[PDB]
Scaffold this active site. Structure first.
Site, PDB file in Angstrom:
ATOM      1  N   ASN A 127      19.915  96.535  39.717  1.00  0.00           N
ATOM      2  CA  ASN A 127      18.941  96.903  38.695  1.00  0.00           C
ATOM      3  C   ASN A 127      19.142  96.161  37.376  1.00  0.00           C
ATOM      4  O   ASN A 127      20.141  96.365  36.678  1.00  0.00           O
ATOM      5  CB  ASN A 127      18.935  98.421  38.468  1.00  0.00           C
ATOM      6  CG  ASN A 127      17.566  98.948  38.070  1.00  0.00           C
ATOM      7  OD1 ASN A 127      16.889  98.386  37.204  1.00  0.00           O
ATOM      8  ND2 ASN A 127      17.152 100.038  38.702  1.00  0.00           N
ATOM      9  N   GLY A 128      18.193  95.279  37.067  1.00  0.00           N
ATOM     10  CA  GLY A 128      18.107  94.632  35.761  1.00  0.00           C
ATOM     11  C   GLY A 128      16.966  95.242  34.966  1.00  0.00           C
ATOM     12  O   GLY A 128      16.219  96.084  35.481  1.00  0.00           O
ATOM     13  N   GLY A 168      13.437  93.353  36.411  1.00  0.00           N
ATOM     14  CA  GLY A 168      13.268  93.339  37.853  1.00  0.00           C
ATOM     15  C   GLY A 168      14.215  94.258  38.587  1.00  0.00           C
ATOM     16  O   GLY A 168      15.425  94.253  38.341  1.00  0.00           O
ATOM     17  N   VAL A 219      15.523  95.074  42.437  1.00  0.00           N
ATOM     18  CA  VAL A 219      15.626  94.358  43.709  1.00  0.00           C
ATOM     19  C   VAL A 219      15.836  95.334  44.862  1.00  0.00           C
ATOM     20  O   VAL A 219      16.831  96.062  44.912  1.00  0.00           O
ATOM     21  CB  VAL A 219      16.743  93.286  43.708  1.00  0.00           C
ATOM     22  CG1 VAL A 219      16.528  92.309  44.844  1.00  0.00           C
ATOM     23  CG2 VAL A 219      16.770  92.538  42.392  1.00  0.00           C
ATOM     24  N   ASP A 247      21.396  78.580  35.618  1.00  0.00           N
ATOM     25  CA  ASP A 247      22.304  79.668  36.042  1.00  0.00           C
ATOM     26  C   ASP A 247      23.196  79.348  37.252  1.00  0.00           C
ATOM     27  O   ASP A 247      23.668  80.257  37.947  1.00  0.00           O
ATOM     28  CB  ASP A 247      21.527  80.973  36.287  1.00  0.00           C
ATOM     29  CG  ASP A 247      22.386  82.225  36.073  1.00  0.00           C
ATOM     30  OD1 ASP A 247      23.565  82.104  35.640  1.00  0.00           O
ATOM     31  OD2 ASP A 247      21.867  83.338  36.340  1.00  0.00           O
TER      32      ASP A 247
END
Length: 360
Positions: free
Chosen positions: A31-32, A35, A37, A147
């Site tokens: 969990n960001g 977004g 997932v 990244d």
């Protein structure tokens, strides 16, 4: 819950054409703020990841536009994408269906660190080869990942394939546009980024892969900086102090500040004694202060380091034969026709394109 199939009209990742897809058994992996997932199972018995993000229907999605224009054996795969309604009109969500992640180079490396042995030298070649090719590709199409780090390298222990993963912080770099300096995970942040340059190029992804390679041989991060400024120190502690000309190329404004003088403690000494001298050389040509001085995405592939893969005589410690490495496209090679001799060994020549320029 419960265990239930849910159907929805979607669009194929490769072509915008509409096809129904169905999936079940989904729960959250991570969990960001930008977004959620989901780990679900696509109706066929293929495991997936679905990324659900909020999307302003008044403009394009940074991520989607890239996934749409990106196909390659070594990037990830956008299967389908579909729009999920928030409530009525108040908001709209965009769901990306992406091939599942068996493992990551990071967890692979962690595995070996339990067994107190560093990961096999050949495996490093194979993984780093695929990454560099993956870069060589997206770069040719103007995309900077921003990244490149162990956690974002999809791995498949049996087959030994690598796939570049997580385009969430990726951006296509249009010349003369400023871009955020505070980018990449700290360890793998390029020095020009620590100097706050905003006019950087894809060369930064190259810097990162150098820090990735090293880390695989070291079993631990090359520059384990504890903060923003400390990260630049850890780098000088090995590479040495940057020259006037060096600090000039990174950021012309920071080129006067007072810096402690430390001599370039050579790599031959920084690594374990048993380390191959070609691996040392490669890392050395990837970790330059001047972004332009770093070997480019393709050029690196032609390094002597990647010769043991070109013979077609090497096999995995698994025992198995090694994954596709030479299935080049016309597009792939056309970025640098110059170096066509190295990239294609004679043992795979029997396909297409031949020896004619064939430039696209």
């Amino acid at each position: 819950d419960p265990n239930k199939v849910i159907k929805v009209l979607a669009s194929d990742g490769k072509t915008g054409e509409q096809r129904e897809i169905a999936y079940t058994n989904c729960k959250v992996i991570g969990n960001g703020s930008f977004g959620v997932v989901f780990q679900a199972k696509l109706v066929e018995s293929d495991e997936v990841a679905i990324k659900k993000v909020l999307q302003d229907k008044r403009f394009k999605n940074r991520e989607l536009q890239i996934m749409r224009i990106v196909k390659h054996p070594n990037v990830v795969d956008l299967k389908a994408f579909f729009y999920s309604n928030g409530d009525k009109k108040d908001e709209v969500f965009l769901n990306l269906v992406l091939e599942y992640v068996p493992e990551t180079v990071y967890r692979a490396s962690r595995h070996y660190a339990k067994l107190k042995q560093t990961m096999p030298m050949l495996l490093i070649k194979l993984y780093m080869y695929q990454l560099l090719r993956s870069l060589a590709y997206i770069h040719s199409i103007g995309i900077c990942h921003r990244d490149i780090k162990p956690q974002n390298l999809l791995l498949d222990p049996p087959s030994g394939v690598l796939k570049l993963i997580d385009f969430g912080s990726a951006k296509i770099l249009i010349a003369g546009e400023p871009n955020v300096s505070y980018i990449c995970s700290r360890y793998y942040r390029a020095p020009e980024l620590i100097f706050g340059a905003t006019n950087y190029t894809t060369n930064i992804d190259i810097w990162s892969t150098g820090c990735v390679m090293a880390e695989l041989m070291q079993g631990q991060p090359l520059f384990p900086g504890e903060s923003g400024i400390d990260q630049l120190v850890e780098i000088i502690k090995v590479l040495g102090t940057p020259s006037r000309e060096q600090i000039k190329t990174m950021n012309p404004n920071y080129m006067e500040h007072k810096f402690p003088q430390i001599r370039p403690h050579p790599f031959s000494k920084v690594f374990r004694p048993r380390t191959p001298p070609d691996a040392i050389d490669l890392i050395s040509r990837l970790l330059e202060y001047t972004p332009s001085a770093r070997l480019t995405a393709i050029e690196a592939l032609c390094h002597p380091f990647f010769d043991e893969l070109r013979t077609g005589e090497a096999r995995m410690p698994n025992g198995r034969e090694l994954p596709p490495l030479f299935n080049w496209t016309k597009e792939e090679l056309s970025v640098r026709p110059d170096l066509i001799s190295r990239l294609v060994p004679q043992h795979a020549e029997a396909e297409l394109l031949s020896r004619g320029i064939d430039v696209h």
